Structure formats: C-alpha cells, structure tokens
Amino acid sequence: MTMMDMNFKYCHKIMKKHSKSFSYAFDLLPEDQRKAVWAIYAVCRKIDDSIDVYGDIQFLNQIKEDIQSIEKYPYEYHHFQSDRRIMMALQHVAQHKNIAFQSFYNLIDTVYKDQHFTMFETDAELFGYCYGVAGTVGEVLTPILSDHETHQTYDVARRLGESLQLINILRDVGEDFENERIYFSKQRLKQYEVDIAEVYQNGVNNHYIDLWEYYAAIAEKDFRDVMDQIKVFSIEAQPIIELAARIYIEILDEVRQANYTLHERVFVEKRKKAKLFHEINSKY
Template identity: 35%
Template sequence: MDEKNKMNVEIAKAYAYCEKIIKKHSKSFYFAFSKLPKEKANAVYAIYAFCRLADDSIDEAETKEEQAKALKKLTEELKEFEQGVEADQYLWIVLRDVFNRYSMSVQPFYDQIKGQTMDYYFKQPQTMKELEDYSYYVAGSVGLMLLPIIASENHKHLEGEAIALGVAMQLTNILRDIGEDFKEIRRIYLPKDVMAQFGYSEAELAKEVINDVLIQMWEYIASRAEQLYDDFSQSLKHFDKDSQQQVALAAKVYEGIINAVRENRYDCSTMKNKTSTATKALLYKDVKNNFSAR
C-alpha cells in the first residue's frame, strides 16, 4: 500500500473514532447530522469530538490542578495545529483534513476552550447578558465551527444566526439540567437577577421546589431560547441545500427538549428530559415534508 492510501485508511479510522464519540454522547446531534452527505457528516463528527475533549478536560479531571493542566495542554495543541503541526492523534488528524477541505477559522476553537475555562472559574451569572455571553463561548462557538461545512457559500454572512442557534441550545441545556447541575456540581446557571426578579431562592432550588414562581422563571428563559430558535430558522434557506433539512432537524430536536420539560411538569431534578425517539421520528417526517413542499 502506498503512502497516500495508508493516509486515507488512517483518516477513515480517525473519522470512525469521532463518529463513535458523537454517537455515544449526543444521540440528538447524531440523529440529525448523520443524515448529511458523508463528507460533511464526518466533518461534524470531528468538530464534536474536539468539543467533547474540551468539555471532558473540565468534567473528567478530579482536581482543579488537573483541570488547569488539561486545558493548558489542549490550548498548546491547538496553537501547534494553527501553526501547521498537529499531534499524531485521531482528533488532530481529522481536524487537519476538515481544515483542508473547508474554509475554517481557528478562532471559534479557541473560544470553545475559553468557554470551558469559564466553567473552570465558574461564577453564577448576574444577568441574562452574562448567561448569553457564556453560552456563546460554550455553544455559539460550535455554530461558528460548523458554518463553513453546512453553509459553504454564505458562512461569512450567517455568523449571527449560527451563534443564535448555539445560544438557544445552551439555554435549553441549562433549563433541562437545573436540578442536576445543582445537585451534582453545585452550580446555578440561572442568572441572579432573574431569580430575584421572580423570587425563586437557592434554598428552594436545593429542595427541588416546583411552584408557580419556578414555572414563570423557567418560561421566561425558555421564551428567550424559543425566540433564538425562531431567529435562526428564518435563515435556513441560505444554508447549503444538502444541509438545510439536517440543520433544521437538529434545531427542532433540541428545541423539543423544552416541550419535554413542560410535559414532565417542569421536573428538572428527577426526570431525564429529552426528545423521545418517537418524537424525533415525527420531527424528521415533518421537516422532510416541509422541504418537499417547497
């Protein structure tokens, strides 16, 4: 086997590795993006694997020192990658292939690491603006990473919309995980001024109190997420034709988590709120029919 074929085999193995990661950790994203053309799907898997590595740098490290060390190592590897020298690991092999194929920018990758660093130095946000700024770094940055792949011709003009989708998804995560975040890692992502505005206390959160105040506060943030999902949906026609349905489906499946919480009577502590397999199938059918009717 010549050198070129060896490299192609190695790249194929690396993409398969990334596909396993997204398939294991995010069934919703995999459900939507696996329906992209293979080359684009592979690129999405690679980006997801990078974000997973950044997230794991915080979540899997047992001490603050280990977290700081892991983030520093990832930053150094990204700097080397930017300079054209990547580590001989599956993740960096496929990212190089992605950067060779698409008009990628490295800045959102640094922004993703900054988002994980914000988690490392976590402080409860004071305002919705602070929460949305944080949401940009941990999730809006992912939208910017994906843009050159799914909007190859118009990616420079769709940055605001891509960020809106990422922020909407992060707000959805926060609404879904209110109880789990507090119980397991003692974090409150709900802004202090929003909790004060509605009169919901940390003591009530600790006791997993579900009352009208919680519901009103939850819906206040949910309405912002739904506005951002709607803002994003207006831009779908500008994405690549072979990616529009898949991107629409990803947004719909994630937005479905909001309705799942409502259906479970706002229980964000004991229920695992997610878009069910049956609902995903219905959303897929609806999205497909909507695009077929155009």
C-alpha cells in the same frame, strides 16, 4: 477502513454517545460534511471534559496546543499531545475547509474560566457564556454547513448555538445544581423570587415555572429567528439543521410534560425524533 477512516469513526462514536439528538440529525448529511461535523463535535466534547481528566488545565492546554499546531502548520505532521485520533481528523478537516480557529480559542477560554465559576449577575453574562460554549461551536460549523458564508451565516449559527445551550440549561437545572452550577442570572432569580436550592428541595412553584418560561421564550424566539433565516445554509444542510433544532427544542415540551422536574433528565425518544424527521422531510 483506512487509518483516517478509523479517526473519523471514533469521532462519530464520541458525538453519538454524547448527543443522540445531534447525531440523529447530522448523520443525514452527505459523507464529507457529516465527517467534518463529527470531528468538530468531538474536539468540542473533549474540551468540555478536559479539566476533569487530571483536575487541572493540563489536558486542556494539550488540546489547545494541538489546535494551534494545526492552525500554524495545517500540512505538517504533528505529535499531538492530546487525543491523537480527534486531532488527526480535525487536521484533515482543516486541510479541506476553513476553520474559525479563534472560535475554538474562545471556547477553550470559556472552559478555563469556568474553573472559577461564580453565578452570573445578569442575563448578559449568561448569554456571553452561551456564546462561549455554544455560539463558538456554531461559528466553527458555519463553513461546513454553507456554500458562501457571510456575516449573516455566522450570526445565525451563533444564535442557534445560543438557543441550543439555553435548552440544555433548561433541561439540566437539577443536575447542574447538584454539580454546583446555576446558570439563571442573579438578577432574574431575584426578580422572580426563585431560590434553586429551595426548589431542588421542595419542588416547583409558579415563581419557578414563570422564571423557567421566561428563558424558554428566549430559546424559542432564537429558534424561530434561525428557522426564518435558514437559507444562509446549503440546500442539503437546511432540512438537517431544521431537524436538529426541532429535535432539540422538543426538549422544552418534554420538561413541561414532566412538570419541570429537577430530579430527572427528560428526553425526546427516538420514535419522536423520527416523527419530526417525517414532518420536515415532507416539507422539503
């Protein structure tokens, strides 16, 4: 192993630890593409955890300044201030591929603002959050996963990111509530007559199920839009992206099978991921 290989292997560890779903699928990409995904994912994962390192924006600003150094001087040596292995790997990617740096800055801004979290008044605010934490990641991945990106490639990547974040929200209602976060909008909670604290205490009811299903239908439509437009991605990436999206959206059926529980994190076991691989691999 070279020094650079060590950097990418660490990024891989971070991605696989955090997401068995995305690692299962994206590890099937050709070597140079999977390595880029690992680095981008690891940066975004580090951003996600950054406030809790000390309890304030310190580490997140260190990350931001490292990304800014790469943007301004991609071919210069940097004393990185944050996670040196991740930033060395990101820099290596930036030397080979176009990175949408503003999308990282939008992600960072979203994480900063989340310090001051207030419940979303409207679904538009919820979807804006989904853009900030997940559509941004799709934008950064777009040049890795396409040959000739257009406005459509970025639209489709944003839309997939938003589907994936909505699925995360739908899986994690109980855990997020424990952590003082409710992502369903106040407007929709009022319309469906749902109080998450009350549901956390007393279990699901038809009102809650109807609200959950309202959002699930959006995630599913987002997913179908992306599958319909999958030809924006490179031929090698298409079945991998279909696999990632199908594995992740299978979580919705797992939630349903578990009666929409607020008290455990449901999952798609490895053997089921493999079944989806076989179904998609046979298709391609």
